[PDB]
Scaffold this active site. Structure first.
Site, PDB file in Angstrom:
ATOM      1  N   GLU A  24       0.851  -1.176   0.000  1.00 13.38           N
ATOM      2  CA  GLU A  24       0.000   0.000   0.000  1.00 13.38           C
ATOM      3  C   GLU A  24       0.887   1.226   0.000  1.00 13.38           C
ATOM      4  OE1 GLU A  24      -1.109   2.351   2.656  1.00 13.38           O
ATOM      5  OE2 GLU A  24       0.565   1.842   3.971  1.00 13.38           O
ATOM      6  N   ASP A  97       0.909  -1.161   6.682  1.00 10.90           N
ATOM      7  CA  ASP A  97       1.332  -0.598   7.954  1.00 10.90           C
ATOM      8  C   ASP A  97       0.696  -1.348   9.111  1.00 10.90           C
ATOM      9  OD1 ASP A  97       3.043   1.438   7.078  1.00 10.90           O
ATOM     10  OD2 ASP A  97       1.384   2.814   6.735  1.00 10.90           O
ATOM     11  N   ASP A  99      -0.440   0.079  11.682  1.00  4.32           N
ATOM     12  CA  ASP A  99      -1.181   1.104  12.397  1.00  4.32           C
ATOM     13  C   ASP A  99      -2.675   0.827  12.242  1.00  4.32           C
ATOM     14  OD1 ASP A  99      -1.616   3.320  13.934  1.00  4.32           O
ATOM     15  OD2 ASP A  99      -0.645   4.750  12.582  1.00  4.32           O
ATOM     16  N   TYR A 358      -2.622  36.564  14.398  1.00  8.98           N
ATOM     17  CA  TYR A 358      -2.800  37.820  15.113  1.00  8.98           C
ATOM     18  C   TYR A 358      -3.478  37.683  16.460  1.00  8.98           C
ATOM     19  CZ  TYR A 358      -1.871  39.680  10.511  1.00  8.98           C
ATOM     20  OH  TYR A 358      -1.300  39.969   9.304  1.00  8.98           O
TER      21      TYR A 358
END
Lengths: 749, 749
Positions: A24, A97, A99, A358
């Site tokens: 993947e 993965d 995960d 800001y």
């Protein structure tokens, strides 16, 4: 043929030996290209002679892409060996993965796709994955680390160890985390790393539930948690290198499905999602020394660095900005920050905030110090992001905060809509539950059998309109005045949560009533409403004849759309894991009450145990003060000798660090670790407070701590539950902080 | 009519009194709605009776939107008073941010648009802006602050002050930064805040240059810096409240035009843009205590919090990733970080890196400690982001780093392309300039008259091909082998900086040569190239007859496109400000050499002065050690009495903090501040080192510092320039760190 590297012997006569490594993403493919042509450095390893690569991350153009390179036929069924020996590769091996995302998405869809069309390929073995170590622990001595493929297999290891001061624990959740030494090391034994999926005749129904619609059964399935694998299951997986479909799907793709709906729906204990809880914990940690102004992008960078926030910054910046808004009809009614700047107004829903370069921010520190008290943040369960301690699992506030601030989710993924509740009506009900001299303490008689006599009605704070209950639902109304001289209708209050500019556009689009009004101007202030609707002449007599005087709604309040219905979808996340739908607001409050009193009992029990061993240590030091003359340590300069001498004269060994500062420790860890230490509460003195003018200090300290221990022991014996009289004082301090904030416009001067 | 609130008396008989407040963005409009309907709280102030609002979201739909509400005619010319008295408003008043963006963009385009069509409206006064304070200083006493509209007007104030320990300086760059108290305070005197633009007959040419094409004159204009306003100019502006067009355009919209092209083009002293210099300074500051591993999003959050990075995170994350890639033919040849993970390979340009959740990073700390030496980071000019000290203006490294690492910009905004230079050929030229016994020290004879005998050729490190100079340009070639058995051509090396997958697609698209080849497979490793091009049969005899044997390029190297031309666009930013185009690589090196020797002279002069006053202080303390008996301070417990006594006995008063740690101070500030302090280098002793066994320590310390002062005084008297022998040792340590890094694959084990 998209990102496809063909193996050398693919499709030839030895095509029953080849593999198709299906990675993947695009960094996994770089790892595989590093590992396959690793060279002469390992002769007994894979190469491009019998391994090809193809990418994923695409019923799409990608799942019809591996069909073209495996030679799969939709019409075949692949039952016997000679019928599945005409494929161009031997198997497919997924490289995803470790995960929540890869093993939940890509493996889940690939297994469901192979089960839908060719279920006789999962049987006899055609879909394989390869799993790379999760945790490696490195010793300061040897170079070869100790490797773990599951986290429970690490928890069963490190619990049986000594002090981990010589070990470095290192987690590998993604394939891009492996260094060149250890990606060279994993391709030594490539064949001891490839596991095979199998079916078990429950996977039929489980593939029917999680994939391909049937949302009713998914709502019935995701109501419970994610039960991780037991020890005997992981040992049975490692014994034969076969993993069932049902265990991987139940554990590793339910967890993705719950992770996706837990960053939208909030927990019901505190009313926060995961990211807002990171922001609160990082704000408590950031502004603790000095409560100085930080700008919003600087505080966002702090939360990304210290609370492990990995989902971009504009989500984080709008969550920091959104929390500190305090206009009429905002999401937070009790904001946790102070907005020094311009954070947007009620007219366009807080979307006109300033740029986060800001505007500034700082904590409330009189609300946030009293709602979430600091001596209970050591008793809450926490999350651990790669071994480091992040934000807690859930806060438990004083007052039920999920029903006090009203917010929805800004998506159409999951249904969630909360309208606030009257503060004067939650305080009466909580103080009827806690106090025993409050005359309505028969709340307990109908907190079980639901026989409800105290009410909960909506907020009507910062609101000048009306709220009326018509049968089952509440309705909000606006206000107007009519000038019968020059026929301008002046709108002065819209209903709840309705922004002004969207309201103006909603009047603009309705052409059946635009044909009556002529011109419309917004002269509102920053927090009130004043809209002039100048009508065409000879209009008011006929708009009564178009829009009828219903009892629920007169002629003007449907002409100008000044009526709002308060629909309310109460879907929440459990603390342990899951999804709960409640159907009244009484039930959320009832669920909250049990959890909070157990934190009162836990923190009183914890304080009782710590005071016991503080008194023990200070009595031992005073006993050393008495007979210090009978210990000639001037020629006992060897530490072990004085230790063995002090072991003879009845002095107990004490772990003094864990007695002084019990840092997130439980009761039983205090009981079984505070008595195993050294004698360095005596043999590390300054020899300056050993004289007479400091012994009075320690005797007075023992007097104070003994009186406090008697106070705690009489707090734990109360009625109706332990710690009741501590929790009423907390309610009074909370409501004084809220009252001090409501008449300061939440600036706290 | 988009976001337009009509003034109440607009278009009527008193339409010569009205104003049209034209706000940019959408938070400015919330500030204006707060200020206009401020109520009865100020009777003498603006309201919606004579002020309307319109937004400026962005020759478009917006500039034709203020035409529709002012009643402007394109065909009129508006010369006389009765001809410009048929407009629906009296004037327009712009409400823009005080930052680089608003006053550069919105005011610049609005003034150019009014000058192009109706230039007789800027004359007689129709375009006005509104001025809001930049800096406010708040005293711990009074509540009314002191306000400044320009920054030079603050620098002329705070230089004349005492110690600013009771003042809070607070900057307001955007309109969303003003609090409720002070946005209420600015609308007291609204009329003392509105300034008017005027023409001065140079604005014709200046509006011709900056707006509306003519890029030749813009390239001639932006070559110099941004000269700020003088004192007499700002006093003449505040006297009559009239600002010329030419001063605002020259100062406040040249600065935007230079800010936009300074985050793409790098400075030529160090070769960095602004964001990369933030990343280097934050990396030096982050990894200074322990050089651990931090993930890329955590280090990005650190740089956003501590070095004031306000431009998103994905730009920051990909810049942190690009600052640590070390494949063949990458942007950095000497990366400043160590990439623990997988940061992408040469095949798709380093854009296949891992996710920044997983990969880690740490400093080099043997390269970065030696190229950018730490005792010159106190002598460089810095930037100040809202009063706080961020990253420096420019580093000055040891070796000329703009021509050593080769990179381009990934845009078509500005032309910039650098190819690296031979390290063995820059070291010979630098060490010919510095050393006086190096026999080619007649470089000085042709560093002025350009008579050049030492060469600079390109890099050819990590490159297996060929580089040939054909007249004026250098060309890179690839390599190939031909099998005359089975007619596969094997490509083994592409030319410089050419990624593999884009090369494959570039062969795929050319259909005049795809009609010969039939398969092309990529079996490359992570850092070498091996591409098989399998040709159709009977092909090699006729591809020689299609693609001719040119002397510069044979038959295969234009069939497979294995030739690259090294174009090089050398556009850089000056340190003071501007744009410089160089046309050879000798000139960049010549410019860099003068700046570096002045840092050697500055840091030696600084060290000489600090050693002078260290010797003075330590001699004074030893003199107090001698006659401490003649000072009975036991009854001199009053501090001022002992101070007045020590003032009599020849002891000098010393500011001891600034002598111990001179923190970013110059030579003259050391000279005029170190002699004005107290006597607390004597009257703050421990009275523990006052005895004999510590006086030998201080006499030896005076011996060491006196020898070091003689060493510095003989370093400043050298030839050819002061500090020459310090800089050769630095070159040798740099090249040993680079050689230690090149044969470790830049991992530094």
């Amino acid at each position: 043929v998209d990102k496809y590297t063909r193996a050398r012997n693919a499709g030839g006569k030895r095509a029953q030996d080849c593999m198709l490594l299906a990675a993947e993403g695009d960094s996994a493919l770089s790892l595989l290209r590093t590992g396959l042509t690793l060279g002469k450095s390992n002769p007994s390893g894979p190469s491009f002679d019998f391994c090809g690569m193809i990418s994923l991350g695409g019923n799409n153009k990608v799942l019809q892409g591996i069909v073209q390179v495996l030679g799969l036929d939709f019409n075949c069924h692949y039952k016997t060996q000679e019928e599945r020996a005409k494929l161009r590769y031997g198997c497919i091996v997924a490289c995803v993965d470790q995960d929540l995302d890869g093993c939940g998405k890509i493996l889940g869809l690939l297994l469901a796709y192979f089960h839908l069309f060719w279920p006789q390929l999962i049987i006899h073995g055609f879909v394989k994955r390869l799993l790379t170590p999760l945790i490696r622990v490195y010793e300061k001595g040897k170079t070869m680390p100790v490797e773990f493929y599951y986290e429970q297999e690490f928890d069963a290891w490190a619990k049986k160890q000594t002090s981990l001061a010589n070990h470095t624990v290192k987690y590998y959740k993604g394939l891009a985390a492996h260094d060149t030494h250890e990606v060279k090391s994993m391709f030594k034994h490539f064949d001891n790393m490839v596991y095979t999926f199998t079916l078990d005749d429950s996977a039929k129904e489980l593939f029917h539930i999680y994939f391909g619609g049937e949302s009713e059964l998914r709502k019935r399935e995701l109501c419970t948690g994610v039960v991780p694998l037991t020890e005997t299951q992981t040992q049975s997986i490692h014994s034969v290198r076969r993993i069932p479909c049902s265990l991987h799907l139940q554990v590793d793709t339910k967890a993705y499905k719950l992770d996706a709906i837990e960053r939208q729906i909030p927990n019901f204990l505190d009313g926060m999602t995961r990211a807002r809880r990171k922001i609160l914990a990082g704000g408590v940690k950031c502004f603790a020394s000095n409560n100085r102004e930080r700008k919003v992008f600087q505080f966002g960078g702090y939360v990304a660095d210290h609370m492990f926030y990995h989902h971009g910054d504009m989500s984080l910046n709008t969550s920091i900005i959104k929390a500190a808004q305090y206009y009429p009809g905002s999401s937070h009614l009790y904001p946790v920050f102070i907005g020094i700047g311009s954070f947007g107004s009620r007219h366009l829903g807080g979307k006109d905030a300033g740029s986060p370069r800001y505007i500034s921010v700082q904590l409330a520190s009189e609300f946030i110090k009293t709602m979430f008290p600091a001596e209970d943040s050591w008793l809450l369960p926490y999350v651990f992001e790669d071994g480091q301690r992040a934000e807690p699992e859930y806060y438990v506030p004083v007052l039920p905060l999920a029903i006090m601030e009203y917010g929805a989710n800004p998506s159409e993924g999951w249904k969630y809509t909360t309208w606030a509740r009257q503060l004067e009506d939650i305080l009466a009900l909580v103080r009827a539950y806690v106090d025993k001299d409050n005359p309505k303490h028969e709340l307990l008689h109908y907190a079980i059998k639901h026989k409800t006599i105290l009410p909960l009605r909506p907020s009507n704070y910062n609101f000048k309109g009306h709220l009326k209950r018509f049968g089952q639902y509440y309705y909000s109304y606006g206000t107007y005045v009519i000038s019968e001289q020059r026929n301008i209708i002046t709108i002065t209050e819209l209903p709840l949560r309705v922004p002004t500019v969207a309201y103006i556009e909603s009047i603009k689009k309705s052409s059946n009533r635009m044909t009556f009004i002529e011109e419309i101007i917004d002269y509102s202030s920053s927090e009130t409403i004043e809209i002039l609707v100048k009508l065409k002449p000879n209009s008011l007599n006929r708009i009564v004849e178009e829009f009828k005087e219903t009892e629920e709604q007169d002629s003007i309040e449907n002409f100008l759309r000044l009526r709002n219905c308060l629909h309310s979808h109460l879907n929440f996340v459990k603390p342990k894991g899951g999804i709960i739908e409640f159907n009244t607001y009484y039930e959320i409050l009832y669920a909250w009450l049990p959890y909070r009193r157990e934190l009162y009992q836990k923190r009183l029990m914890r304080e009782h145990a710590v005071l016991k061993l503080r008194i023990i240590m200070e009595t031992a030091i005073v006993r050393y003060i008495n007979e210090s003359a009978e210990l000639n340590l001037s020629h006992y300069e060897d530490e072990k000798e004085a230790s063995r001498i002090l072991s003879e004269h009845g002095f107990p060994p004490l772990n003094h660090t864990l007695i002084i500062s019990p840092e997130f420790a439980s009761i039983e860890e205090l009981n079984q670790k505070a008595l195993q230490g050294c004698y360095t509460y005596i043999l590390s003195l300054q020899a300056r407070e050993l004289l007479i003018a400091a012994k009075t200090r320690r005797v007075e300290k023992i007097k104070k701590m003994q009186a406090r221990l008697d106070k705690v022991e009489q707090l734990l014996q109360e009625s109706p539950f332990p710690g009741a009289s501590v929790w009423l004082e907390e309610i009074d301090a909370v409501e004084k902080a809220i009252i001090k904030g409501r008449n300061t416009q939440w600036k706290f001067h």
